[PDB]
Amino acid sequence: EIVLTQSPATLSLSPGERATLSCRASKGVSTSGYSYLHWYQQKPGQAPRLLIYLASYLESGVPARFSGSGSGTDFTLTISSLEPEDFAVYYCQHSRDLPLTFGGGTKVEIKRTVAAPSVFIFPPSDEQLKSGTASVVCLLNNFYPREAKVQWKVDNALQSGNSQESVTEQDSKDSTYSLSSTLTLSKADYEKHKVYACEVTHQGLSSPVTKSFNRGEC
Amino acid sequence: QVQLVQSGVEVKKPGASVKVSCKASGYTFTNYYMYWVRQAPGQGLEWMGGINPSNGGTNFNEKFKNRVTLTTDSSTTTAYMELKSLQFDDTAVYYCARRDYRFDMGFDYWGQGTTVTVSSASTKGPSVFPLAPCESTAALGCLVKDYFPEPVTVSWNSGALTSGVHTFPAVLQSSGLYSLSSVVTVPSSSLGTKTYTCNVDHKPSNTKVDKRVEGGPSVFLFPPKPKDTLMISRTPEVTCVVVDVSQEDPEVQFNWYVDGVEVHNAKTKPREEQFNSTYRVVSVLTVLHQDWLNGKEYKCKVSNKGLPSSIEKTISKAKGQPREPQVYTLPPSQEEMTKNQVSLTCLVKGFYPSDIAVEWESNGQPENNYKTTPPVLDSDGSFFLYSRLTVDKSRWQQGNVFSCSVMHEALHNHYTQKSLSLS
Ligand SMILES: *[C@@H]1O[C@H](CO)[C@@H](O[C@@H]2O[C@H](CO)[C@@H](O[C@@H]3O[C@H](CO[C@H]4O[C@H](CO)[C@@H](O)[C@H](O)[C@@H]4O[C@@H]4O[C@H](CO)[C@@H](O)[C@H](O)[C@H]4NC(C)=O)[C@@H](O)[C@H](O[C@H]4O[C@H](CO)[C@@H](O)[C@H](O)[C@@H]4O[C@@H]4O[C@H](CO)[C@@H](O)[C@H](O)[C@H]4NC(C)=O)[C@@H]3O)[C@H](O)[C@H]2NC(C)=O)[C@H](O)[C@H]1NC(C)=O
Ligand SMILES: OC[C@H]1O[C@@](CO)(O[C@H]2O[C@H](CO)[C@@H](O)[C@H](O)[C@H]2O)[C@@H](O)[C@@H]1O
Ligand SMILES: OC[C@H]1O[C@@](CO)(O[C@H]2O[C@H](CO)[C@@H](O)[C@H](O)[C@H]2O)[C@@H](O)[C@@H]1O
Numbered sequence: 316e317i318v319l320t321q322s323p324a325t326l327s328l329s330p331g332e333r334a335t336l337s338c339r340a341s342k343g344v345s346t347s348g349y350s351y352l353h354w355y356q357q358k359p360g361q362a363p364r365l366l367i368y369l370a371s372y373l374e375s376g377v378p379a380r381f382s383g384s385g386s387g388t389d390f391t392l393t394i395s396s397l398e399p400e401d402f403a404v405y406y407c408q409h410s411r412d413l414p415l416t417f418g419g420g421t422k423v424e425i426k427r428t429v430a431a432p433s434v435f436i437f438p439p440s441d442e443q444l445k446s447g448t449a450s451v452v453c454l455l456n457n458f459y460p461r462e463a464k465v466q467w468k469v470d471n472a473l474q475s476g477n478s479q480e481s482v483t484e485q486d487s488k489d490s491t492y493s494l495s496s497t498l499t500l501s502k503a504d505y506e507k508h509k510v511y512a513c514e515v516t517h518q519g520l521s522s523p524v525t526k527s528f529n530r531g532e533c
Numbered sequence: 534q535v536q537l538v539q540s541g542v543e544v545k546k547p548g549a550s551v552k553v554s555c556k557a558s559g560y561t562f563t564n565y566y567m568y569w570v571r572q573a574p575g576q577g578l579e580w581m582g583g584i585n586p587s588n589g590g591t592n593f594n595e596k597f598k599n600r601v602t603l604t605t606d607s608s609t610t611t612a613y614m615e616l617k618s619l620q621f622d623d624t625a626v627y628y629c630a631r632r633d634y635r636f637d638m639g640f641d642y643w644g645q646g647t648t649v650t651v652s653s654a655s656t657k658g659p660s661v662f663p664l665a666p667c668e669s670t671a672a673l674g675c676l677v678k679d680y681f682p683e684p685v686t687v688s689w690n691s692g693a694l695t696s697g698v699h700t701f702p703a704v705l706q707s708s709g710l711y712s713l714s715s716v717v718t719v720p721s722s723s724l725g726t727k728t729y730t731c732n733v734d735h736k737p738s739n740t741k742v743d744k745r746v747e748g749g750p751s752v753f754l755f756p757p758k759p760k761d762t763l764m765i766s767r768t769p770e771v772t773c774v775v776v777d778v779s780q781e782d783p784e785v786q787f788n789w790y791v792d793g794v795e796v797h798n799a800k801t802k803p804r805e806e807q808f809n810s811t812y813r814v815v816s817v818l819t820v821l822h823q824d825w826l827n828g829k830e831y832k833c834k835v836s837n838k839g840l841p842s843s844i845e846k847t848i849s850k851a852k853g854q855p856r857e858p859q860v861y862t863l864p865p866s867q868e869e870m871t872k873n874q875v876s877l878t879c880l881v882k883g884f885y886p887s888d889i890a891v892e893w894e895s896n897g898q899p900e901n902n903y904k905t906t907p908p909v910l911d912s913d914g915s916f917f918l919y920s921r922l923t924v925d926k927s928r929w930q931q932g933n934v935f936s937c938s939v940m941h942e943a944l945h946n947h948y949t950q951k952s953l954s955l956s
């Protein structure tokens with residue numbers, strides 16, 4: 316099959332700036348004067364919307380600021396001046412042959428000044444502990460950019476497989492991200508150790524930030 | 534009026550089958566292929582197959598060619614997608630999309646999406662646990678654990694608390710039940726005074742729970758010059774200046790709002806190093822003359838890595854009924870005539886707001902040797918001021934005319950004048 320690779324995975328820009336999105340096919344998608352390469356916009360919870368068809372043709376009703384170009388294996392989508400409504404995900408798709416394939420998408424995101432996360436650790440409640448479970452929640456609040464690593468240490472032992480992350484959408488007012496990591500244990504396993512630590516790394520932190528508590532001393 | 538209306542949420546058990554429909558209207562069904570595309574949680578788009586509604590001919594993706602059946606009912610112009618032997622990784626949004634049969638111009642129209650969730654779980658209400666700590670800002674929240682199906686909505690203090698709230702998207706656990714957290718950040722000082730309650734609603738189980746959970750840069754915002762907002766020839770501007778920006782964080786950022794709406798036409802000046810090892814940076818928003826005069830609020834939000842949170846500053850024209858200035862010119866005192874220079878006075882009073890411009894001229898050329906007092910509040914709520922022009926006694930004795938000109942929004946043509954002369 317023809318594989319489409321979009322780059323960059325994330326594009327960080329400001330309203331008014333020129334956005335340039337790249338799409339590269341593993342095999343050529345051009346034949347007989349046309350390139351079978353089309354662009355779509357997807358907003359969270361909404362169905363994709365056709366922007367550009369056949370590499371460079373503007374779909375009826377799409378704003379003039381959207382333009383496509385390229386041929387063979389290399390394609391570009393340009394937004395001449397970003398509007399607040401254009402911060403979304405963009406996919407390329409070919410139809411040179413079957414199977415039809417899409418690229419992995421490119422997120423056009425609002426750029427802003429680096430903001431370090433405020434890190435908080437929350438021990439499990441006495442209510443949850445009556446049932447045989449313990450959830451330790453770590454919150455990384457209002458940070459930018461999106462990239463962050465969170466590690467759990469139980470008595471300085473690095474954990475794996477027993478935690479899940481969840482990230483919010485970029486904030487409509489301050490353009491930041493928030494993240495939560497939840498370490499899950501049985502009450503039996505929670506009672507075996509005493510130091511529960513959350514170690515966070517982010518561009519905005521010169522050294523990792525570790526938040527912890529001592530089980531029983533709360 | 535082209536429409537592609539898909540069927541609603543599907544919650545199915547592993548091994549079962551689902552059948553999604555796509556109701557088409559506003560076009561000739563026959564002229565277009567109907568395609569099916571799925572999107573797994575947090576993943577991209579995947580083409581499954583397409584059907585020709587005239588002859589029923591199909592094309593598939595090899596991954597789906599043996600579990601998917603595509604059919605069309607031309608009477609009810611509906612396309613259908615049957616996915617059999619459902620696996621847990623079949624959880625996704627399924628889209629039908631049309632493609633022109635005659636000439637390929639992409640998937641020009643898509644249905645709204647049909648969420649299919651493959652799960653051995655049955656309806657279950659969440660357990661709600663408080664998230665409270667064991668620093669100027671405090672964090673608190675609610676862990677909404679083990680519920681099925683989605684969604685749960687979380688509010689704080691019955692919708693009174695909206696600022697600083699983050700309700701995280703749910704995580705599917707190993708058990709097949711969802712779980713999420715809702716947090717809020719608040720001033721640590723409030724913890725004693727204020728109460729915080731999270732209101733959890735899970736409509737599928739009819740569950741409702743209300744759980745009680747128990748030095749840097751500085752910004753100055755300047756209004757436009759009063760003459761600028763009153764003359765269409767001049768350009769009025771609001772100015773945001775941030776001082777005490779660290780040598781370690783040159784991060785120059787401004788966001789501007791007019792009556793709470795963001796605008797992008799401000800011009801940020803280049804960073805300026807100060808004699809006290811800090812930077813100074815200015816942003817200039819040009820304003821509409823009538824927007825300043827109609828009382829629109831101009832907000833400047835400053836962001837920097839050295840600011841734990843953004844510094845907002847607002848500025849508008851003073852509220853209250855505009856009142857018109859009264860202009861009186863008073864000649865020099867006879868006791869001042871024993872001097873080489875004399876004082877021409879201009880009394881401007883009874884005006885509101887205090888934004889005004891006062892100047893002097895003679896023979897249509899500016900007289901720049903004057904000083905004006907700042908406006909002073911009167912007991913009736915209006916302002917007043919005096920302007921003093923220093924003239925050579927000679928100039929006055931020759932009967933040359935001097936003029937005190939005043940510019941204020943409440944005046945007709947924003948302008949008035951009073952002349953002064955030796956009788
Ligand atoms: C390092 O070196 C820096 C440079 O020397 C230095 O910067 C200086 O920092 C101080 C604060 O620390 C800042 O002071 C403020 O000044 C406001 C007026 O500034 C005018 O006028 C001065 C001259 O008097 C000029 O030098 C300024 O540049 C500025 O000029 C204006 O600029 C605009 C735009 O370019 C032009 O359009 C104007 O025409 C022009 N005007 C003139 C006359 O030329 C002053 O208003 C501030 O006062 C308010 O805050 C004080 C607390 O900080 C309060 O005590 C005071 O009451 C005022 O409170 C306000 O009151 C309002 C209600 O009445 C409220 O709505 C407001 O919210 C409230 N404000 C606040 C914050 O609460 C203030 O004195 C200097 O201006 C600044 N200098 C420059 C050149 O930028 C750094 O501080 C040095 N750092 C260190 C560590 O030493
Ligand atoms: O937009 C189609 C086509 O028009 C050209 C000129 O042939 O550019 C014009 O239109 C743009 C959008 O309105 C303007 O920004 C530009 O100044 C104007 O010349 C082409 O460049 C474009 O492909
Ligand atoms: O031309 C588009 C756009 O460019 C800006 C960017 O600040 O400035 C240009 O025009 C100036 C003259 O008005 C030049 O001095 C400058 O070099 C040039 O970039 C805007 O003013 C203008 O809208």
Ligand SMILES: Cn1c(=O)c2c(ncn2C)n(C)c1=O
Nearest residue numbers: 349368369372373375636638
């Ligand atoms: C594919 N295609 C179009 O879709 C098109 C066009 N001119 C206008 N349109 C819309 N041309 C020349 C074209 O080749």
